[PDB]
Amino acid sequence: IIGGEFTTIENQPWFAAIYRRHRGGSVTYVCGGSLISPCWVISATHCFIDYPKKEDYIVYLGRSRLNSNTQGEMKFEVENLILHKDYSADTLAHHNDIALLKIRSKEGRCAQPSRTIQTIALPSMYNDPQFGTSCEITGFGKEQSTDYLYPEQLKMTVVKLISHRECQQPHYYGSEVTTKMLCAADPQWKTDSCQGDSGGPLVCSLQGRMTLTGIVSWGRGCALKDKPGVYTRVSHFLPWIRSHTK
Ligand SMILES: COc1ccc2ccc(C(=N)N)cc2c1-c1cnn(S(C)(=O)=O)c1
Ligand code: NA
């Protein structure tokens, strides 16, 4: 996250921290995710497509720091890694960038809701917030495009939704951004998601309810003029989510 502010997991209790175990024992941060039910985490397929082996991944809930065992956190293994069958990546645009992770503790149990571990509601079909709506993003991603390290403390920021017709303008993304994607940015281009924030949530308050409207997917640079953050529009994928969580 470029700009914005540091936060803790009690502010974003649906946030999942996803890590990968390498040969030799080293563990590195991969992507963010969101808890949509006790046994299920939703993320982005591009996070796992090059290493699609479920045994490689570690999922944490109730974790606020990149290398601290936050009080009340829960550690899980991936029982089932579900990638979208028609996923593909162009020079910029990522298609069907959505994945599901069935989580299980070493004792065989799913998440236990608490003050730091909570689910996030899914949107209803054909009901996305109007363009201009302010929404929040969360992640352990880069603070600056030139950084190579991720921040130790979890971050958050607020961006505004951008219409499909504006996002399709020639100086924006043209025909590369589709109706299955949602654009969001800062009007002053000072804050945004970046590398490391992928798979994480775009949460919008819609008709009084906190909703998982988007999943961090792609963008040209980070906080670059006329180049919004692009997110998987979760409302389009409700039939796919329901079928694969059964
Ligand atoms: C693999 O990098 C990624 C990966 C995912 C991204 C998701 C969203 C955005 C965004 N602008 N909201 C940027 C991203 C970049 C990304 C795009 N450019 N850069 S950088 C660090 O400037 O080279 C990082
Ligand atoms: Na840390």
CATH architecture, range 13-119+236-246: Beta Barrel (2.40)
Does 97 participate in catalysis according to the annotation?
yes
Question: What distance in Å separates the CA atoms of residue 40 and residue 14, rounded to the nearest whole number?
Answer: 11
> Could you tell me which residues come within 8 angstroms of residue 153 by beta carbon, excluding any fewer than 6 positions away?
6, 7, 64, 65, 66
Answer whether 138's CB lies under 8 Å from 200's CB: yes
Cβ of 178 closer than 6 Å to ligand 1, yes or no, is: no
- Residue from 33, 167, 161 nearest 93 by CA: 167
Residue nearest to atom 18 of ligand 1 (CA): 221
CATH class of 1-12+120-235: mainly beta
Residue nearest to atom 21 of ligand 1 (CA): 145
Structural domain spans, the chain: 1-12+120-235, 13-119+236-246
Does 192 participate in catalysis according to the annotation?
no
Cβ of 192 closer than 6 Å to ligand 1, yes or no, is: yes
CA of 226 to the centre of ligand 1 (A): 14
Could you give the angle at the alpha carbon of 122 between the alpha carbons of 197 and 213, nearest 5°?
A: 45
- Torsion sign across C-alpha atoms 147, 220, 193, 54: negative
Domain pair 1-12+120-235 / 13-119+236-246, same fold: yes
Length of the chain (residues): 246
